Amino acid sequence: MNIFEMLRIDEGLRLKIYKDTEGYYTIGIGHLLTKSPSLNAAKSELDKAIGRNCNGVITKDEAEKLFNQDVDAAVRGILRNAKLKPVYDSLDAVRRCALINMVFQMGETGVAGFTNSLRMLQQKRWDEAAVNLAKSRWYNQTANRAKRVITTFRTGTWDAYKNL
């Protein structure tokens, strides 16, 4: 298992504009298009992102291209962030994937806000961190996904996904 397979399980693949859990306009493998309520605004962002007139629909290849870009941007973002880099550096490989997963879903800023949990992961207090992470809107809003990520930080294995 690797980061791409992990995120492909959590996000799914849709080839037509769709609404995410929060109601935002999204496409492909979790690629957010706009927070704007307008479907037109969405279609416009899409064409800009692909370089073609897509009329709300893309190919598998196009989905994967946006995906490769998003994963790279997530990793680069952690590495440039002063609160995140040090945590990332401290972690083992599997746990690194779990932090990348969070950043991809909630953005750098969002993740950097989990001050206490970040401290705990740094200190390698797995159980304490799993419990703290669960006290969040995140856990209430996307519970099955949050649980998979949480278990990943907890155990340092891919068991939550070996199922899936």
Coordinates of C-alpha atoms in Angstrom, one line a residue:
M1 CA 0.0 0.0 0.0
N2 CA 1.2 3.6 -0.7
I3 CA -0.2 7.1 -0.5
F4 CA -1.9 7.0 -3.9
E5 CA -3.8 3.7 -3.1
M6 CA -4.6 5.1 0.3
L7 CA -6.1 8.3 -0.9
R8 CA -7.8 6.5 -3.8
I9 CA -9.7 4.4 -1.2
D10 CA -10.7 7.5 0.9
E11 CA -11.7 9.8 -1.9
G12 CA -13.0 7.6 -4.6
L13 CA -12.9 8.5 -8.4
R14 CA -15.7 10.5 -10.1
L15 CA -15.4 11.6 -13.7
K16 CA -18.2 14.2 -13.5
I17 CA -18.5 17.3 -11.3
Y18 CA -19.9 16.3 -7.9
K19 CA -20.5 17.7 -4.6
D20 CA -18.2 16.7 -1.7
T21 CA -19.3 15.9 1.8
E22 CA -19.3 19.6 2.6
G23 CA -21.3 20.5 -0.4
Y24 CA -18.4 21.8 -2.5
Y25 CA -17.9 21.3 -6.2
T26 CA -15.3 18.5 -6.7
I27 CA -14.0 16.2 -9.5
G28 CA -11.8 13.2 -10.0
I29 CA -10.0 11.9 -6.9
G30 CA -11.0 14.5 -4.3
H31 CA -9.9 17.5 -6.4
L32 CA -11.8 20.5 -4.9
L33 CA -12.8 22.9 -7.6
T34 CA -14.4 25.8 -5.8
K35 CA -16.2 26.6 -2.5
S36 CA -18.5 28.7 -4.6
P37 CA -22.1 27.8 -4.9
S38 CA -22.1 28.3 -8.7
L39 CA -21.9 25.3 -11.0
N40 CA -20.7 27.6 -13.7
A41 CA -17.9 28.9 -11.5
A42 CA -17.1 25.2 -11.0
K43 CA -17.0 24.4 -14.7
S44 CA -14.9 27.4 -15.3
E45 CA -12.3 26.3 -12.7
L46 CA -12.4 22.9 -14.3
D47 CA -11.6 24.1 -17.8
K48 CA -8.8 26.2 -16.4
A49 CA -7.4 23.3 -14.5
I50 CA -7.4 20.9 -17.5
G51 CA -6.7 23.3 -20.3
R52 CA -9.7 22.2 -22.2
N53 CA -13.4 22.8 -22.6
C54 CA -14.7 20.0 -20.5
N55 CA -18.2 20.7 -20.0
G56 CA -18.1 19.2 -16.4
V57 CA -16.6 15.9 -17.5
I58 CA -13.0 14.5 -17.6
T59 CA -11.2 11.3 -18.5
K60 CA -9.5 8.9 -16.2
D61 CA -6.1 10.1 -17.3
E62 CA -7.1 13.7 -16.5
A63 CA -8.2 12.6 -13.1
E64 CA -5.0 10.9 -12.4
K65 CA -3.0 13.9 -13.6
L66 CA -4.8 16.3 -11.2
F67 CA -4.2 13.6 -8.5
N68 CA -0.5 13.4 -9.1
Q69 CA -0.4 17.2 -8.8
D70 CA -2.4 17.3 -5.6
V71 CA -0.3 14.7 -3.9
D72 CA 2.9 16.5 -4.8
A73 CA 1.5 19.8 -3.6
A74 CA 0.4 18.3 -0.3
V75 CA 3.9 16.8 0.3
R76 CA 5.7 20.1 -0.7
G77 CA 3.3 22.0 1.5
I78 CA 4.1 20.0 4.6
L79 CA 7.8 20.5 3.9
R80 CA 7.5 24.2 3.6
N81 CA 5.4 24.5 6.7
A82 CA 7.2 25.2 9.9
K83 CA 4.7 23.6 12.1
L84 CA 4.3 20.5 9.9
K85 CA 7.8 19.7 8.7
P86 CA 9.2 18.8 12.0
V87 CA 6.4 16.4 12.7
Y88 CA 6.7 14.8 9.3
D89 CA 10.5 14.5 9.8
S90 CA 9.9 12.7 13.1
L91 CA 7.6 10.1 11.8
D92 CA 8.0 6.6 10.3
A93 CA 6.9 6.0 6.7
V94 CA 3.4 4.7 7.3
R95 CA 2.6 7.6 9.7
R96 CA 4.0 10.0 7.2
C97 CA 1.3 8.8 4.7
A98 CA -1.5 9.5 7.4
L99 CA -0.3 13.1 7.8
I100 CA -0.2 13.5 4.1
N101 CA -3.8 12.2 3.9
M102 CA -5.0 14.8 6.4
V103 CA -3.2 17.7 4.5
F104 CA -4.7 16.6 1.2
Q105 CA -8.3 16.6 2.7
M106 CA -8.1 19.7 5.0
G107 CA -5.2 21.8 3.8
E108 CA -2.0 22.8 5.5
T109 CA -3.6 25.4 7.6
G110 CA -6.3 23.2 8.8
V111 CA -3.9 20.5 9.9
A112 CA -1.4 23.0 11.4
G113 CA -4.4 23.9 13.7
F114 CA -4.3 20.5 15.5
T115 CA -1.6 21.8 17.9
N116 CA -2.0 19.3 20.6
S117 CA -2.2 16.2 18.4
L118 CA 0.8 17.3 16.4
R119 CA 2.8 17.6 19.7
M120 CA 1.7 14.1 20.7
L121 CA 2.6 12.5 17.4
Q122 CA 6.0 14.1 17.7
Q123 CA 6.5 12.7 21.1
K124 CA 5.3 9.3 19.8
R125 CA 2.3 9.1 22.2
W126 CA 0.1 7.1 19.8
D127 CA -2.8 6.3 22.0
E128 CA -3.0 9.8 23.4
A129 CA -2.8 11.3 20.0
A130 CA -5.6 9.0 18.6
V131 CA -7.9 10.1 21.4
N132 CA -7.2 13.8 20.9
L133 CA -7.6 13.6 17.1
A134 CA -11.1 12.2 17.6
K135 CA -12.2 15.4 19.4
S136 CA -12.7 17.4 16.2
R137 CA -15.3 18.5 13.8
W138 CA -13.2 16.4 11.3
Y139 CA -14.0 13.1 13.2
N140 CA -17.7 14.0 13.5
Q141 CA -18.1 15.0 9.9
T142 CA -16.1 12.2 8.1
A143 CA -16.1 9.5 10.7
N144 CA -15.2 6.4 8.7
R145 CA -12.4 8.1 7.0
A146 CA -11.1 9.9 10.1
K147 CA -11.1 6.4 11.9
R148 CA -9.0 4.9 9.2
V149 CA -6.5 7.7 9.5
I150 CA -6.5 7.7 13.2
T151 CA -5.9 3.9 13.3
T152 CA -3.0 4.4 10.9
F153 CA -1.4 7.0 13.3
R154 CA -2.2 4.7 16.2
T155 CA -0.7 1.5 15.0
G156 CA 1.8 2.5 12.3
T157 CA 0.4 -0.3 10.0
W158 CA -2.0 -0.4 7.0
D159 CA -4.5 -2.6 8.7
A160 CA -7.4 -0.1 8.4
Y161 CA -7.1 -0.2 4.7
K162 CA -6.3 -3.9 4.2
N163 CA -9.9 -4.5 4.6
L164 CA -10.9 -2.0 1.8

